[PDB]
């Protein structure tokens, strides 16, 4: 059959939409002639569209000797990225001779998968502002997803999909009341759309999160159970819902907690979820192991998490909890002490826990001493109240009034005439009245 005839059939079938028989005639062209770079480009494109990224990767690797010229940089990078080989895809995109729009957008997706939200946000801003196409709403909701992730985990102040992502961003920013209203607006936009229930399942999964945050635990649990029973096809959403149910259950529904944990560790979960989400999952299952007498695996998870130095979730406390549960917590004393010493920026909450441990049975004076050592939160009305009542327990009146004086002086230096300031002055005045 004449080669232009096969090319015309290939073009017609490629614009038709299906690709299997297009691949069959492309490889017929290949067996006709071995040295047409367009034929192998069509072959790798057909393989990518058919979901066989490994086969296209193998073809590119085997034919790299003859490819040359422009090279299949974008196709190889996309095959690596879809094969979770993000690290190699980074240099595959970076080592390309020329940068195209497809390469830039693939690079943005890879950077999102790398949690490098700054460069990903910049490149996707450039993508939205520069490239115009038929999926501009998809680009908008992807940029909104990036900013929502950054605001939720990196602590950065910033259609139903875009509304849901805006609700996610509001959740990250700390707003909860208007998040429910925006999620209801997105629920309306979804309900008018399909009349495909997984897109409503994720909306309800985010709704139940807000319900749990505000204290409405029962409705959140019912929503989570109904979402789980609806069986959405996603895997990351199931992990998020499962660990939120973990947090709701705490140490009560351990039998369902094991089920949620087994749903939390599935195939592809480590790639769909962020690193912060995975670390919080590790923290949650370490907590569950602690509450389920599993100590060795709890310690293993805690050590593995500490090896990564988490930004927000300090796991040494869990280990301290371990040494508090087995009643030989004298080692925990120096453990938290040295952790606070090595990490002055995180020492404050560690010493706050240290104080509670040093009021557990006795040695209250040392507890007050380590409470005083927390300079960051020293002049707070609650902590000075605790110090005053502790000092009054053993009648250290002078220490209590001197604590009052330091708190008052610091408040005068920083925020004079505050309502909390005047409350402190009046409380100190009446305490001195009732204690000379």
């Amino acid at each position: 059959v004449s080669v232009p005839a096969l090319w015309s059939e290939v073009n017609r079938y490629g614009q038709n939409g299906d690709f299997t028989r297009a691949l069959k005639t492309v490889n017929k062209i290949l067996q006709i002639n071995k040295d047409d770079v367009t034929a192998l480009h069509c072959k790798v494109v057909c393989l990518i569209q058919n979901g066989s990224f490994k086969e296209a990767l193998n073809v590119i690797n085997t034919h790299t000797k003859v490819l040359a010229n422009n090279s299949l940089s974008f196709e190889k990078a996309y095959c690596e990225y879809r094969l979770n080989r993000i690290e190699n895809a980074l240099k595959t995109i970076e080592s390309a001779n020329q940068q195209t729009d497809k390469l830039k957008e693939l690079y943005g997706q890879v950077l999102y998968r790398l949690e490098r939200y700054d460069e990903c946000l910049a490149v996707y801003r450039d993508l939205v502002r520069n490239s115009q196409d038929d999926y501009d709403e998809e680009r908008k909701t992807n940029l909104s997803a990036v900013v929502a992730a950054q605001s939720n985990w990196e602590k950065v102040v910033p259609t139903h999909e875009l509304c849901y992502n805006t609700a996610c961003a509001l959740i990250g920013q700390g707003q909860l009341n208007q998040a429910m209203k925006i999620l209801q607006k997105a629920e309306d936009l979804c309900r008018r759309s399909l009349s495909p229930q997984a897109e409503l399942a994720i909306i309800h999964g985010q709704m139940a999160y807000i319900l749990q945050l505000q204290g409405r635990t029962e409705e959140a649990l019912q929503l989570y159970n109904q979402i789980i029973k609806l069986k959405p096809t996603d895997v990351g959403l199931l992990a998020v819902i499962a660990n939120n149910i973990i947090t709701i259950n705490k140490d009560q529904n351990v039998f369902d907690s094991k089920k949620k944990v087994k749903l939390t560790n599935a195939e592809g979960v480590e790639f769909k979820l962020s690193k912060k989400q995975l670390q919080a999952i590790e923290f949650n299952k370490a907590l569950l192991a602690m509450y389920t007498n599993q100590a060795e695996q709890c310690r293993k998870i805690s050590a593995s998490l500490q090896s990564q130095s988490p930004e927000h979730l300090l796991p040494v406390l869990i280990q301290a909890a371990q040494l508090c549960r087995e009643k030989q917590h004298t080692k925990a004393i120096e453990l938290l002490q040295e952790f606070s010493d090595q990490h002055p920026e995180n020492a404050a909450e560690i010493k706050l826990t240290m104080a509670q441990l040093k009021i557990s049975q006795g040695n209250i004076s040392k507890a007050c001493l380590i409470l005083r050592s927390i300079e960051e939160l020293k002049h707070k009305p609650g902590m000075v109240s605790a110090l005053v009542t502790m000092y009054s327990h053993e009648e250290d009146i002078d220490s209590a009034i001197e604590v009052f004086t330091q708190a008052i002086q610091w408040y005068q230096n920083h925020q004079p005439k505050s309502p909390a300031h005047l409350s402190l002055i009046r409380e100190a005045a009446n305490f001195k009245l009732k204690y000379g």
């Binding site: 004449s2 232009p4 090319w7 015309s8 490629g14 297009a22 367009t38 480009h41 069509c42 974008f74 196709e75 990225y81 957008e105 693939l106 997706q109 999102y112 196409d133 999926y135 998809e138 909701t141 992807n142 909104s144 997803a145 990036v146 992730a149 939720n152 992502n165 996610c168 990250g172 994720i202 985010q206 999160y209 998020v240 939120n244 973990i246 947090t247 769909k272 979820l273 912060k276 989400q277 919080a280 907590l287 602690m290 509450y291 406390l317 869990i318 549960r325 909450e349 706050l352 826990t353 104080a355 509670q356 009021i359 707070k380 009305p381 609650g382 902590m383 109240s385 605790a386 009542t389």
Partner: protein, 56 residues
């Protein structure tokens, strides 16, 4: 817990007995929000090269 009560001057005499309740010990669980909706648009960019140079 007292960690979430760093305001006012409640007497809360539980602080001097065993049940101090200064902080969440054992530490509390950490729920995570659902991951934002992201779209793999790069699947839309894979297509045949221009065949106009090699058609009939």
């Amino acid at each position: 817990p007292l960690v979430e009560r760093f305001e006012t001057f409640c007497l809360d005499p539980s602080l001097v007995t065993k049940q101090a309740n200064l902080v969440h010990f054992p530490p509390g669980f950490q729920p995570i929000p659902c991951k934002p909706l992201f779209f793999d648009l790069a699947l839309n960019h894979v297509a045949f090269p221009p065949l106009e140079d090699k058609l009939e």
